[PDB]
Amino acid sequence: ASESETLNPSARIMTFYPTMEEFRNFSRYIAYIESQGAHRAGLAKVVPPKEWKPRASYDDIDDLVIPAPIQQLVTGQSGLFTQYNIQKKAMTVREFRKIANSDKYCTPRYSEFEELERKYWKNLTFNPPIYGADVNGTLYEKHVDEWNIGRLRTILDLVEKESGITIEGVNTPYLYFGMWKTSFAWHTEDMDLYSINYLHFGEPKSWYSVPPEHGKRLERLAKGFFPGSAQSCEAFLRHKMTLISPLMLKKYGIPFDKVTQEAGEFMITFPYGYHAGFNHGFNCAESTNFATRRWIEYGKQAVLCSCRKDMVKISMDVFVRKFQPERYKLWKAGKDNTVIDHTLPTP
Ligand SMILES: O=C(O)CCC(=O)C(=O)O
Ligand SMILES: [Fe+2]
Ligand SMILES: [Zn+2]
Structure with missing residues (x-):
C-alpha cells in the first residue's frame, strides 16, 4: 500500500552504483533513486561507474587561488556549538595544502572512524582550522557530459534562463578545499533546493x-538551545553557524544517519534535508544546487532568514506558472494551502 514506504520508513541513507548507462542522464537517475526512497533520508550517496573521470589529473592546480579562506573558530560545550568565521585573505592552493599537512593541523592517528569521530567532537573548539570554502569554479573538463556540476541542465536553469540572474554556489559551482576538522554546520539548502557534492x-x-x-x-530542538538566535531570525540555522553532535541528537530522540564520503564519490542532499559534517584531512570538493519538479512545492514554502539582508531569495513565480498553471491564480492570491508529503516521489 502507498508506494511511499520504499525506503522502509527507516529513512536510511542509501548508496547507489549506477551503470554508465543510467549514469548518463542526471535528471533521470535522480527520479530513479527517489523511486527507491533515497530522499527519505535527506542524503544519498552515488558511486560513479569505475571508468568515469571528470578530470585527467589534479596536478595542475597548486597555483589556483582561494580568494576568501576562512578560519573557523568554534565556541561551545557538551554537544552544542556556534561557529564563527574569520576571513583570512587570499592564498594559493599550494600554500593551503602546506598548512593542511603540517603536523600543526594534520589528521590525528586513529583506527576506526568511530574513533576519528570522537576526536572531532572532543577538539573542534581547539586549533581553529582554515577552510578554503566557496571558491567560484569547476575542476571538470569541458568534454565531460555526465554529471557536470557546471551544467547539470535541471529546471533550476529556469532562473538564469528567465532573468539572467546568477547566484554563486547556487546555480554556479563552488570548490571547497578543506583540512582536518573543518566543518559545515547544520542546514538545508537555500530555498530548500537539492545539492550535489563531488x-x-x-x-x-x-x-x-x-x-x-x-x-x-x-528546528524545535535548535530553537530551544539557541533561543536568542531563534528570535532574531526566523531561520537562524540558515546562518550556518550551529553545530550539534550526534550524541545530543540521540539524547533528544531526533532521528538521523551518518555516512562517510570518499574521493571519487557523489553526495546528494534532498529538499529540506538537514545535514552537517566535517573533513578528515586535506581534500577538495565541488558543489552546486539543482532542482526537480518535486522541489517546487518546497521552494514555495521555504522559510527564509529575515535579518540578514543579502540572503538567497528566488522568485517562484516562473515555476508555479510553468509547472503548476492550474494553481497559479490561487497561489498568487496567497491562498494555496498545499501540504507537503516528504515520502512522495517526482512522478
Ligand atoms: O563541504 C562542505 O563544507 C559543505 C558541503 C555542502 O554543504 C553540500 O554539499 O551541500
Ligand atoms: Fe549543504
Ligand atoms: Zn537570518
Whole structure:
C-alpha cells in the first residue's frame, strides 16, 4: 500500500552504483533513486561507474587561488556549538595544502572512524582550522557530459534562463578545499533546493543527516538551545553557524544517519534535508544546487532568514506558472494551502 514506504520508513541513507548507462542522464537517475526512497533520508550517496573521470589529473592546480579562506573558530560545550568565521585573505592552493599537512593541523592517528569521530567532537573548539570554502569554479573538463556540476541542465536553469540572474554556489559551482576538522554546520539548502557534492580527491568527508520528515523536530530542538538566535531570525540555522553532535541528537530522540564520503564519490542532499559534517584531512570538493519538479512545492514554502539582508531569495513565480498553471491564480492570491508529503516521489 502507498508506494511511499520504499525506503522502509527507516529513512536510511542509501548508496547507489549506477551503470554508465543510467549514469548518463542526471535528471533521470535522480527520479530513479527517489523511486527507491533515497530522499527519505535527506542524503544519498552515488558511486560513479569505475571508468568515469571528470578530470585527467589534479596536478595542475597548486597555483589556483582561494580568494576568501576562512578560519573557523568554534565556541561551545557538551554537544552544542556556534561557529564563527574569520576571513583570512587570499592564498594559493599550494600554500593551503602546506598548512593542511603540517603536523600543526594534520589528521590525528586513529583506527576506526568511530574513533576519528570522537576526536572531532572532543577538539573542534581547539586549533581553529582554515577552510578554503566557496571558491567560484569547476575542476571538470569541458568534454565531460555526465554529471557536470557546471551544467547539470535541471529546471533550476529556469532562473538564469528567465532573468539572467546568477547566484554563486547556487546555480554556479563552488570548490571547497578543506583540512582536518573543518566543518559545515547544520542546514538545508537555500530555498530548500537539492545539492550535489563531488569529492575530487583527498581525505574523506563525513556527513550527518536528518530525514526531511523530521526536519521540523530538529528546528524545535535548535530553537530551544539557541533561543536568542531563534528570535532574531526566523531561520537562524540558515546562518550556518550551529553545530550539534550526534550524541545530543540521540539524547533528544531526533532521528538521523551518518555516512562517510570518499574521493571519487557523489553526495546528494534532498529538499529540506538537514545535514552537517566535517573533513578528515586535506581534500577538495565541488558543489552546486539543482532542482526537480518535486522541489517546487518546497521552494514555495521555504522559510527564509529575515535579518540578514543579502540572503538567497528566488522568485517562484516562473515555476508555479510553468509547472503548476492550474494553481497559479490561487497561489498568487496567497491562498494555496498545499501540504507537503516528504515520502512522495517526482512522478
Ligand atoms: O563541504 C562542505 O563544507 C559543505 C558541503 C555542502 O554543504 C553540500 O554539499 O551541500
Ligand atoms: Fe549543504
Ligand atoms: Zn537570518
